[PDB]
Amino acid sequence: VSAHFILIHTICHGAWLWYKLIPLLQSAGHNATAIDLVASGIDPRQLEQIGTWEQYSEPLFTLIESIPEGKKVILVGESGGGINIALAAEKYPEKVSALVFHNALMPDIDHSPAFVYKKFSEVFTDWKDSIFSNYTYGNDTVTAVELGDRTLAENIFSNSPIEDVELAKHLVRKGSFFEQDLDTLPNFTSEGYGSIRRVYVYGEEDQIFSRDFQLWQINNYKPDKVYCVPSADHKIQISKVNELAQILQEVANSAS
C-alpha cells in the first residue's frame, strides 16, 4: 500500500512540526507532504495580511488542485488543523480518501463550521502566559494569539521531550482562528465533507483538548473509527510518532 498523506499543522505552528513522522511514513513506502499555511512556519507573509480561512488555507487548496487524475490523498489535520482539512474535503471531496483528526477540531454538518471551536473556547480558557492581541482586516477586527512558554510546556507539548518544547519556542508565530470568517461560512454537507471516511485519533494525556471535549466531538458526529494513544499529549506527532505512524498505516490500508 502506497498512499499520499498531506499533513496540516494548527495555527501558530507549521510544517516543521511533522519532522518525526514524515520519515516514518516514507520508510513504509508512502508519500508524506507537510506544508506551511499562510503566515505560518517560514511562510514569508505576515498574519495581518490575512483574515479568512480561504486565504489561510490557500496553500492546501493549491496543493490538492495539483493532484492528478482520479488520485486521492489522505488528509491529516492536528488541533485547529482539523478545520482546514474539513474545508478541503468540502471543496474537493473527490480527491480525499480519508480524513484523520489528530487531537483535532472535527466539524459536523448540522451546525455552523465554527460550532466545534465555540465549544472548545467555552470549555478551555486557561491560557496562562499566552499573549492575545488583535488587528484590523477590512470590517473585521481579528483576534490573534502568541503561544506562551507555559502553555507550550504544560498544556500542548505536555508530555514531549523538553527539546521539542524548546524547538516550538523558537518557531511558533502569532496565529488566529479567524472566527468571524468561520461563523460566516455555510455548513458542511453530506455530499462533501460528510461523504469521506473520518478517523478520530486522540492522546490520552492531552492537556488542552480534554477527554470530555474530545469525547463530546466523537459523539456529536460519530467517526468511522477512533484511536486512543496511551501516554500521548496534544502533539501525538511529537510525543508518540511510532504509534501515530502505526495508526496511519492501517488508515492507508483501509483506504483501499
Add this chain to the structure above:
Amino acid sequence: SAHFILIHTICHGAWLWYKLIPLLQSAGHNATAIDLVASGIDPRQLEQIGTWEQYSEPLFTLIESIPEGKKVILVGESGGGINIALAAEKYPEKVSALVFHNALMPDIDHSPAFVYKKFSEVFTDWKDSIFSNYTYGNDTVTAVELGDRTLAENIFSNSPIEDVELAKHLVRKGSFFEQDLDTLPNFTSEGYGSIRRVYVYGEEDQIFSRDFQLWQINNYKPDKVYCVPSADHKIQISKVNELAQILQEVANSASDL
C-alpha cells in the same frame, strides 16, 4: 554558570540549537539562541539587507544589553563564526570565549573574508542547491537556497533523518554578503584577537573537510581544539552530549577570569 549565546549559520536559525539549550540549562547555564535578520522566523526578507552589520544586528543588540563586568560565551556554527568574530571585535570586553563549531574562524593578518574565500575555493559540490542574486544598495548580492541532497549528504550527513526533514521545512534563502565582508577592516589583536578561541570540529564533516578545518587551525592557532568522533557538520544535532560536555569545560575555563 555561564551565559552562552548561540549563533546559527546562514540559511539556518535559532531552531537549530533545540537539542542543546536544555542540556546547557540543566547544567546551570543560561543559553540563548536568536534568529539573525531574515533567518529562522525573523519577519524580514533577505532582499532587505546586504551587509554583515545589518545581518548581525540582533546579536549586537543583545550584547549591548549585557552590562559592564559581565561576559558571555559566543558559540558560532559554520558561517556563524564570522558573526561571533565581528561581535568580539566590536565588544571585546563583553566576551569571555569564542567557540567555533565546524565554523569559519577568521584571523588578523588577512581580510575578514579570507577564510570564506578559501572554503569557496575548496568546496564546490553544491548539488541541488539553488543560487540566485539580487541588488542591495550599490552591490549585487549572491544568495543560496540549500538543496535537499546538500542537507542530507553534506551538512546533516550523520544526523537522524528527522533532523534532515526538519531542516528541509525550515531553511531559508541566505547569503554571505561577500562584497561587504571583503570591505571590512581586518580584525585586530586587541579586539577579536584578544579573546580565548576554542575550535570544535566534527570527524565526519562532509562540507568542511578535515584538511580545511586543519588549515584554519594552523592559519591562526586557537587556544584549544576539540575533535568530536562521528560528528557531522551539525554537531549540535548529531552529537549534542559531547558538544555540551565540551561547552561545560569552556565555561569552567572561563570562570576565574
